[model samples]
Target: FYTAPSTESKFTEVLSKAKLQYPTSTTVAFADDLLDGYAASYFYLTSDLYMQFQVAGSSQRSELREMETSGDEAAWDCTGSTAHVASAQIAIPVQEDGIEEVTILQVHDSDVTPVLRISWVSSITIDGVTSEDVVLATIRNGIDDSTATKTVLQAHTTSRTEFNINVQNSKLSITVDGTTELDEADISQFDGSTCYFKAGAYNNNPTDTSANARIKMYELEWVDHH
Candidate 1:
């Protein structure tokens, strides 16, 4: 129920639907500059498709932000962190109508190893109101690629994470392995309805020797028909 944005027109269609009445700020996050990563917030813009997701863990408190317009790309430049920070903004359309899939792709661009966490939430908060919280994955034990589990960042690559969240029913199937918790609402109500979705990072293991890390996002999805 998903397709990659192989062309500019495809990406534009998604952004057009998700564009807010006015411009707004969006962010993608990570724990370290090179490794652990995730999209911290849901974007409220239409032209946030070309944003690059990058951040470093040189300090304990790290954060980044972006402003974008049509045909422009959002960029990331972090001073590093000992914890996690926002990577980039991925605008996805979760309108009620049909089944669709959104692929959150990231590229590592640093010398340090990174820990990546991919997640999303809309009608309900994924991790609630504070950081260090998210809607836990259904991965009973460690993370698994085939199931909807919280993922742990290992090596940096041009690879990506796929989230099949039914905006109509809010039924989600994700692939990851990490420490996470799903609020009761995300798994219960909001069936077959429009919603806000997001992905980000929590920890890149900044305490480890591979503290320096970098990341770049490739694409995201938002559709009324899939």
Candidate 2:
């Protein structure tokens, strides 16, 4: 299981096991960060991907007080042919009267660029009116690719929208709320490399000073592809 941004200062990073990633004020996290397996709070622009997953009086589930790992859940992921299924709500704040862009999820490929990226863009003009939307984007060669291309898939008129991403057999599909936005999109561009799923906020604006980019991982499940 990979943890985000960085799990520790300088040398340390995400571990294959349960590791506590210290919260920070950078572009990564504006609010308190939680590592527990429970769903969080959903009160703000981004809420409760880590809320009370029923840690309860039994701390047997979560550290609770420290907002750390819950039980002994190992992250499940697959290589080129399998898939990752995640259902979550995302809220990317509009900057004053301008738009905001935040990456909520990705098909990560090692230290290289991700295979697929889903981002929430706040407030944009569709036709003549302005609205917020989610976009599916990719780099041409996936891992280590340089150019950014908008993959002709955008989900508009959405706020705190629940979404889904399923990757299987070198192809991926997506949905927002009830509508299918993209499907069976060819990811053969990724060069058949090993990959994993990543969730949480990554501000496209990395100059620091956090913005309201939030995500709620309502549920996540995975299985192998035939």
Candidate 3:
């Protein structure tokens, strides 16, 4: 029963309704520059909430974040050939610490990097300790299986993968497809400053002029568990 917005204005409006920031902060030149062989990165909603992301080259990134109402906002920078370009986020207000649960079904077609990150970051003292951005959870593809101790999902180019995360205070539960990777365990040192969820593709081969990554999302949902 969901229908995608048809026009650019409608798309912007939909992003606004979702309280997503930087609904439009990209230019064709930047995308073209980041994606060497590709000229642009495109994101379109297949249905009301179903979405598709496509980029032809490497290094280029796109993301949407939660509404920053006013606070110690986080900042990011891009350098070298590959960089951290954002795509989408679910904002968890500073007062709430972070999200309680998230579930997504996505399919990736590229043989490059596709990532998901959970961040509760900023500068402040937590019991007399200080640090930079604190990442609560990170999920990605393409890691040496012999040395990787963290949960890494092996995405097949031909099928969709189910990803899920559950947060119970400092404890995090992660699952891939139907298998549990990590149970209720402490994964972050959150100090209740601010937090959010970020999802998108950031190429690992920035030096490769022809490297590219494409990802598609059919469903995404989050629970505040407040």
Which of the numbered candidates is closest to the native, going by highest TM-score?
A: 2
Across 167-212, the per-residue lDDT of candidate 3 in tens digits comes to 4444445665666666754423332223344343333223334543
Ranking of all candidate structures by their TM-score, best first: 2, 3, 1
Candidate 1 lDDT tens digits, 157-177: 234433332222322333332
- On TM-score, the stronger of 1 and 3 is 3
User: Candidate 1's error at 49, in angstroms?
Assistant: 11
* Model 2 score (lDDT): 0.43
Candidate 2 ranges with C-alpha deviation above 4 Å: 1-79, 91-99, 122-134, 152-160, 206-212, 221-226
Backbone Cα, N, C clashes tallied per candidate: 57, 10, 6
Q: What is the C-alpha RMSD of each candidate to the true structure, in Å?
A: 17.1, 10.8, 15.2
lDDT per residue for candidate 2 within 97-197, as digits (tens), equals 22255555666664455667776565445446555455655534554557555553465433566677777767777887767777677777665465655
RMSD of 1: 17.1
Model 3 lDDT on a 0 to 1 scale: 0.34
Rate residue 222 of model 3 by lDDT.
Answer: 36
Error of 2 at 214 (Å): 2.9
Model 3 ranges with Cα > 4 A deviation: 1-41, 46-50, 56-59, 68-149, 155-157
Best by lDDT: 2
